[PDB]
Every structure is written in C-alpha cells, then in structure tokens.
Tab-separated table of C-alpha atoms in Angstrom:
chain	number	residue	atom	x	y	z
A	1	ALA	CA	-11.084	-35.856	-7.660
A	2	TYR	CA	-7.798	-33.536	-8.490
A	3	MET	CA	-10.730	-30.561	-7.682
A	4	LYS	CA	-11.775	-31.285	-4.122
A	5	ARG	CA	-8.169	-31.562	-4.083
A	6	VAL	CA	-7.669	-28.584	-5.428
A	7	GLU	CA	-10.409	-26.677	-3.243
A	8	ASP	CA	-9.430	-28.679	0.657
A	9	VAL	CA	-6.189	-27.209	-0.159
A	10	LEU	CA	-7.383	-23.412	-1.441
A	11	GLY	CA	-10.308	-23.225	0.948
A	12	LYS	CA	-13.749	-22.763	-0.687
A	13	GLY	CA	-12.569	-19.299	-2.199
A	14	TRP	CA	-11.077	-20.965	-4.495
A	15	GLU	CA	-11.602	-19.673	-8.385
A	16	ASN	CA	-11.281	-16.559	-6.528
A	17	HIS	CA	-7.941	-16.935	-6.127
A	18	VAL	CA	-5.065	-16.291	-8.157
A	19	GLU	CA	-4.791	-19.721	-10.036
A	20	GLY	CA	-8.165	-21.372	-9.306
A	21	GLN	CA	-9.441	-19.120	-11.935
A	22	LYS	CA	-7.482	-20.578	-14.058
A	23	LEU	CA	-7.871	-24.269	-13.664
A	24	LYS	CA	-11.303	-23.909	-13.844
A	25	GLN	CA	-11.672	-22.846	-17.071
A	26	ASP	CA	-9.528	-26.188	-17.655
A	27	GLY	CA	-10.858	-28.416	-15.995
A	28	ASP	CA	-13.980	-26.960	-16.977
A	29	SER	CA	-13.314	-26.952	-20.972
A	30	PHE	CA	-11.147	-30.285	-20.520
A	31	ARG	CA	-14.406	-31.787	-18.967
A	32	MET	CA	-16.616	-30.627	-22.087
A	33	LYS	CA	-14.006	-32.221	-24.261
A	34	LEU	CA	-15.197	-35.411	-21.803
A	35	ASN	CA	-19.735	-35.150	-22.361
A	36	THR	CA	-19.672	-38.598	-24.720
A	37	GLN	CA	-22.963	-39.139	-24.832
A	38	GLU	CA	-22.919	-38.159	-28.788
A	39	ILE	CA	-21.281	-41.208	-29.121
A	40	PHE	CA	-23.880	-43.076	-27.293
A	41	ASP	CA	-25.962	-41.180	-29.734
A	42	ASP	CA	-24.715	-41.925	-33.090
A	43	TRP	CA	-23.277	-45.734	-31.559
A	44	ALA	CA	-27.158	-45.918	-30.608
A	45	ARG	CA	-28.247	-45.104	-34.045
A	46	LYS	CA	-25.856	-46.961	-35.900
A	47	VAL	CA	-27.066	-50.319	-33.146
A	48	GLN	CA	-30.527	-49.143	-34.392
A	49	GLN	CA	-29.989	-49.336	-38.415
A	50	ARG	CA	-29.120	-52.492	-37.485
A	51	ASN	CA	-31.702	-53.578	-35.250
A	52	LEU	CA	-33.581	-52.989	-38.683
A	53	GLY	CA	-33.206	-56.505	-39.487
A	54	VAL	CA	-30.630	-58.510	-37.295
A	55	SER	CA	-31.409	-57.972	-33.672
A	56	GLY	CA	-34.129	-60.757	-33.305
A	57	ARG	CA	-32.853	-62.732	-36.901
A	58	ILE	CA	-35.069	-65.941	-34.783
A	59	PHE	CA	-37.150	-65.271	-38.129
A	60	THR	CA	-35.173	-68.620	-39.018
A	61	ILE	CA	-34.562	-70.931	-36.548
A	62	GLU	CA	-32.479	-73.229	-38.332
A	63	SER	CA	-31.765	-70.928	-41.727
A	64	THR	CA	-31.457	-72.588	-45.037
A	65	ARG	CA	-27.551	-72.359	-46.853
B	1	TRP	CA	-8.451	-7.487	0.058
B	2	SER	CA	-6.891	-10.252	-0.027
B	3	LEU	CA	-3.556	-10.321	-2.222
B	4	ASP	CA	-5.736	-14.039	-4.535
B	5	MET	CA	-8.550	-12.790	-4.258
B	6	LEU	CA	-9.794	-9.422	-5.995
B	7	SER	CA	-13.962	-10.280	-7.358
B	8	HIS	CA	-15.378	-9.091	-3.678
B	9	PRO	CA	-13.415	-6.961	-1.221
B	10	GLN	CA	-12.281	-9.184	2.105
B	11	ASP	CA	-13.271	-6.177	4.540
B	12	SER	CA	-15.104	-2.909	3.511
B	13	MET	CA	-16.973	0.411	5.057
B	14	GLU	CA	-16.889	3.740	3.673
B	15	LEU	CA	-15.447	6.497	5.342
B	16	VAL	CA	-18.105	9.001	6.697
B	17	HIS	CA	-17.655	11.864	9.680
B	18	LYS	CA	-20.494	12.412	12.334
B	19	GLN	CA	-22.310	13.681	9.324
B	20	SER	CA	-23.138	11.573	6.348
B	21	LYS	CA	-21.175	13.532	3.530
B	22	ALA	CA	-18.345	12.314	1.978
B	23	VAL	CA	-15.134	11.667	3.043
B	24	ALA	CA	-12.990	12.977	-0.278
B	25	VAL	CA	-9.694	11.518	0.562
B	26	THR	CA	-6.432	11.856	-0.899
B	27	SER	CA	-3.168	10.080	-0.143
B	28	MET	CA	-4.134	8.547	3.434
B	29	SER	CA	-1.326	6.870	5.619
B	30	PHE	CA	-0.816	4.048	8.392
B	31	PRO	CA	1.404	5.605	11.295
B	32	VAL	CA	3.988	2.697	12.542
B	33	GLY	CA	2.936	-0.739	13.126
B	34	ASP	CA	-0.251	-0.215	12.086
B	35	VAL	CA	-2.562	0.291	14.365
B	36	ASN	CA	-4.898	0.141	11.903
B	37	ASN	CA	-5.606	4.437	13.001
B	38	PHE	CA	-4.294	5.684	9.693
B	39	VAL	CA	-4.946	9.131	8.742
B	40	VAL	CA	-6.372	10.735	5.793
B	41	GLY	CA	-5.679	13.434	3.777
B	42	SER	CA	-9.019	14.998	2.843
B	43	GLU	CA	-9.706	17.526	0.073
B	44	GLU	CA	-9.244	20.126	2.301
B	45	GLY	CA	-9.067	20.046	5.770
B	46	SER	CA	-10.790	17.861	7.839
B	47	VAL	CA	-7.632	16.036	8.038
B	48	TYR	CA	-8.651	12.888	9.616
B	49	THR	CA	-7.861	9.404	11.734
B	50	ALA	CA	-9.129	6.051	11.693
B	51	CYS	CA	-9.997	3.083	12.628
B	52	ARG	CA	-10.582	0.024	10.728
B	53	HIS	CA	-11.158	-2.418	13.833
B	54	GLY	CA	-14.153	-2.284	16.231
B	55	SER	CA	-18.167	-0.493	15.671
B	56	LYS	CA	-16.112	2.682	15.992
B	57	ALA	CA	-14.024	1.808	12.819
B	58	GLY	CA	-14.228	5.010	10.212
B	59	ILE	CA	-13.238	8.813	11.177
B	60	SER	CA	-12.343	9.337	14.643
B	61	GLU	CA	-11.958	12.891	14.387
B	62	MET	CA	-11.344	16.369	12.429
B	63	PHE	CA	-8.730	18.709	12.836
B	64	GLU	CA	-8.232	21.857	10.475
B	65	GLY	CA	-5.266	23.926	10.376
B	66	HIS	CA	-5.260	24.854	6.143
B	67	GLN	CA	-7.665	25.115	4.490
B	68	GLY	CA	-5.696	24.978	0.571
B	69	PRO	CA	-6.834	22.034	-0.344
B	70	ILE	CA	-4.659	18.086	0.961
B	71	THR	CA	-2.155	16.377	-0.719
B	72	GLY	CA	-0.089	14.055	1.223
B	73	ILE	CA	0.376	12.886	4.345
B	74	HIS	CA	3.252	10.791	6.113
B	75	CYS	CA	3.854	9.149	9.446
B	76	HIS	CA	7.305	8.273	10.949
C-alpha cells in the first residue's frame, strides 16, 4: 500500500526518479525476506511426520490405558 | 533530461543541417530568456542557431565568418 502511495505521489515514472530506485530496491529485498512458503513447507513436513501415525487415531475408539 | 529521471532522455533528437551530415557541436549556449534558439558552436565554422520546439527544431541556418575550429560562444 505504501508502494502504491509512493508511485501515485511520484508519478508512474517513479524509480527513474532519484529516490524511487532506492525505495524500490529496499521494498523488494524486504519483500524477499517475507516469502514464507518455506515455513509452510518445513512445517507441513513436520505435520506429515506427525500424520504418519497420529492424525487419524480413531483406530482404537476406546483405547486401552 | 529531468533532474529526477536520468535513465532515459525526456526529450531528445539529433542535430543535422539540411544535409544529413553531423554537427560536431562544441560549447553551445542558449540566449537570454530560453527562447530555445540556442546558438551552437560547431567544430569549425558553420555556427548555427537551433530551435527546440516545433517541427523546425534543430538547426536553423549556417553563418561562416571564420575557418579555425570553434571553441566557444556566449550571449548576453
């Protein structure tokens, strides 16, 4: 939303402008430090690891104890 | 060029006379008021007046009154 604020303020020629190139680079790297699909990957692996023998444990409806 | 955007010229064209030969400019100068009719010190002689806006932009006419290669020009 800030980026669209920036370009609406600075026109569409915006990174060509002296500062826009900088803020572009910074927002891009900041965005790259936010692509969280790895968290879902590794966490889905841990979930799958648990899913191997836990998620459907109705195999003993009234399990002994 | 704008002083903001510099990755591409804002407005740009060449400078050729009636013939398609180059105009090796050297120290041009706009006159007083920026009437876009800047004078251009060419390489040697053929000093020109050149416009910027309109289809007639660029080289207007050649006046030669010296043969040594030009080094500068100024207006007042």
